[PDB]
C-alpha cells in the first residue's frame, strides 16, 4: 500500500484473500473483503492479488476480459505522462511510475479507478453464480422458519434489485412464499408488523 | 484503530471475527470478543466488520433495524457539523469527517455510542436465541455431574437475571434440579458448602 | 500489554487462547501458553482473556471462587491509593489506575501477583481433572512400547510428585509396569541404561 | 529482506509457503506466491525457503540440479569481490558479502538472478506435472458446463502455448470438444459470441 | 530475540512452532524451520519453546537427557563470570546475565552452542524415528511412478549417507528397485539420463 511512502504488501493479506476465496467462493460478502484488503493498493499489488486465486480460472479470465474492455472504452473516451488503457492494467508501467502518479499534485487516483473496474467485474461474476431466482424459494413442509428466512434473505441480497424493488420483494414475497401455517400466523399478526415480531411469533 | 493517527484495519481482525461467528454463532462469549476486536474502531470500520459476515443474514438485518431505530430515537432526544443519527451510523459521513471528530477538542465519541448500540443489539439477539429456560434443565439418570453442572451454569449465564436473582438461582435451582443421588450428597454436605467442595464430593 | 506505554491487546492472543483451550482442554501444557500470552497484561486484560472462554463454565466459576478467596486472604494479611482485594480483580478499579500503578516508582507488580493466583487456580484445576493415577497405567498385550511410554510420561507429568519421587517413579515404575517382553528386554539391558538405549532396544 | 537495512525473515512467510505447497502442490498459481513471498530475499533466505518444503523431495532436488546447471552455464558465459557460480547459489558466501553486494553501487541483483533461475525451474516442474493435454478434455454426458469449462481453462493455463496458440485453442477447442447439447447451443449463438454470452446461454 | 536490545518473543512464533510439531511430528523439514524460528534466541527462550510442546513427552525427555550429557562433556572438556554447563541450559542463570553475555566484548555465543546441541538431539531423534531403510522401498504393481519416486527420495533424505554414497544410491537403487515396466523404460533411455527426462518418459 501507500501510506507518504511505499510499503511492501504483506503475506498476511495474500493468505487472507486466498483463504476467503477458497472458503466462500463468490458469495456476496467476498466483495467487502476485497474492498478492505485493497486499501491503498497499487495496480501491481492488485494484479498480484488477482493472480493468487488458484481455482475458478474461468471467472478470472472473465475478469481480465472485462477490465481490458473497460480500459479500451476509457481510451476511446479519454485519449509525468498521462496513463493509457494498458497503464491502468499495470502491464506496461513500472512501479516507480505508479508511485509517481500516486504522489503527484494533483493526485490521479488510478488505483481507485482500477478497483472500481474490478468491483464491477466481481459484481458481474457474483450475478452469474446466482444459484436461483427469488421467486423459486418456497418453504418446505417441515423446514424451520428461521433457516428458510435466512436462505430467502441471502437470495434477495444476491439479486440486484433496487431499494424500492428490494423493499417490495421483502414485503410481498416473504408473506406469499411462506408455508401456510406461518403465512396464517403472519396474517394474524397484521400489516405493519416488524421483522422481529414476526420471527418471534413464528418460533 | 486510532492511536493520534489513523491506522489501517488488519486482516487478522476480520479473519478472527468471521471465524468466531462461524464457530460459535451467538453464544454469549462472542460479545466480549467483539468488544476486544473493535478497540478504537471508527463506525466505517464497524460497518465493514458487520458486512463481512456471510451467513445469518436475518440476524444482520435485525441488527441494522435495531441500530437505525436507536439512531432515530437519539435524534428525537438530541436534535465541524453536529452529527445526526445517520451520521453516527457512518452511512452519510466520510472517513475524514470521522477522523476530524475523533481528534476534536472536546472529543465526540461516536465510536463508543455506535458500539453501545451494537452491544445492545447483540444482547437482544443472544437473549432471543436463548435455547431453553433454566427450569427445563434436569439431570439425567446417568448424566455426569460435571457436564450437567457446566450445562446448567451455561444456561444461567445465557439468561438475563440480576445478580441477586442469579445468586438465588445458583443456590436453589442447582440443588433442587439435580439428580437424586447428587441431591442427597449435597444435602449430606450441608448448607454453606462451597461449589468446589460439592463438586469434589459428587465425583 | 505494557512496553513504557500501554498497547492494545491483539486479536491473535485471544484467538490463540480460545483455540488452545478448545483443542487441549486442561492438559498441563496449556499453562505455559497462558504464561506466554499474558506477558505484560493488565488485570482488565486477564478478565477479558478469562471471559472469552465459551465452554467449561464450571471451571471458570471454580477459578473465580479461588481468586476471590485468595484476594480475601490477601486483604486479611495485607490490610496513589493502595490496592484492595477487589482492585486486583479489576472489578472496582479503572484502566487508568492500573496504568498508574504499573508505572509507579517503585512499581507495584499487581499483574504478577494476579498471575500467580491464576496459575495457582489452574494448577489446582489441572490436578483435579487428572484422569488416573500413575499406578493404574499398565502396558497392553499388543500396545506399542513407544505409545505406552509416552502416555506413562504424560501421566507422570500430570501428577504432583517431587523431583526425587518423580525420578524414583521413572526408574522403578517404568520397568515394573511394562509388559513382560519389554520388562525382560530392560532387565537384560541392565541397570543404569539410559532411556534412549532402552527405547531403541525395545523397538 | 532488504528494505536500506537487513530485516530478519518473518515466520509468517515460511508458514504461508509451506502451507501453500502442502495445499496446492505445484499448481500454476503457486509461482506468483513465490514471487510475492520472495520480495527482497537474499540467497540465504531463498535456500532456507526451498529447504523448508518437506514432501516432493524429487522436485526440490531437481530444482537444485537445474539451478546448479544455470550457475555452471553462467560461469561459462561470465567467468568488492565478484560473485562466482557457487556464490549465486548462496553455498559459499557469507551474509556480510551478500548484504554488501545488495548495497553496492552499481547494485548487483544477485537476488533477481537467483529468483529467475528458481522460477525457471518451477516452471519446468509444473510443466512436468501437467496431468493431461488439452485434447484429452471432453465434456461428460451429465458434466456441468461451468465445471467442465473451468477444468478446461485450468488445463489450458497449465500448458505453455503462445498467445496466438492459446487464443486459437480457446476458440476452436472449447466449441469442438464440448458435449453435443452445449455445442449446438454455441453454434446457435453464432461466431464472435463472448464468453459471458455463451456461459449464460449454456446454463 | 536480540536485535542491540532484547525484544519479547511473539505469540506468533510459539503458535507456529506448536502447530508445525502437531502437523508434521519429526519429519526432517521441521529442523530448518526450528533453526529459522530460533534466530537470535536466548536459552531461556529455547526452554520456553521446548516446554510449549504438549505431546511427544518421551522425545522431549530424551532431548533433555542428551543436552545435559553434552553440557556435562563440555564441562569436562571446558572447565563477567564464565558460563558453566547448567548455565547454558538456562536453569541457573537469570535473564539479565544472558543479555549481558550476548552483548559482551568479545561475545560468547552460548546461544549458538545451545542451538547446536538442540539440533544434534533433534537429528538423533529424527534418525531414531526413521520408519524404514532405503532398501525396503519397492514399487507396487500399480503404484504411480511419481508417488513412488517421491516416497523413495523422502526416505533417502531421511538417511545420513554422504554425498558420494547418496549419489550412487540415487543412480543404482532407483533404477534397480523400480517396477519392471519403469525399469525397462529407464534401461531403454540409457545411462546418463537426467531425473527429469526419466520421469517425463515414464509418465
Residue numbers in the entry:
A (entry chain A), B (entry chain E), C (entry chain D), D (entry chain B), E (entry chain C): 1 to 3, 10 to 85, 96 to 219
Q: What did the article's authors report about this structure?
A:
The HIV-1 capsid is a fullerene cone made up of hexamers and pentamers of the CA protein. In the fullerene cone HIV-1 capsid, the central channels of the hexameric and pentameric capsomers each contain a ring of arginine (Arg18) residues that perform essential roles in capsid assembly and function. The ability of the HIV-1 CA protein to generate two different capsomers is controlled by a molecular switch—a Thr-Val-Gly-Gly (TVGG) motif—that adopts two distinct conformations which dictate whether a CA subunit will form a hexamer or pentamer. Here, we show that these Arg18 mutant CLPs contain a non-canonical pentamer conformation and distinct lattice characteristics that do not follow the fullerene geometry of retroviral capsids.
In contrast, the R18L pentamer unexpectedly adopts a configuration that is distinct from the WT pentamer. Arg173 is clearly resolved in our cryoEM map of the R18L pentamer as pointing towards the bottom of NTD helix 3, as also seen in all HIV-1 CA hexamer structures solved to date. Secondly, the Met66 sidechain, which functions as a gate, is resolved in the “closed” configuration, again as seen in the hexamer. Thus, we conclude that, like the N21C/A22C disulfide crosslink, the R18L mutation allows for assembly of the alternative pentameric CA ring, which has no need for refolding of the TVGG switch into its 310 helix configuration. In the R18L pentamer, the leucine sidechains are within van der Waals packing distance.
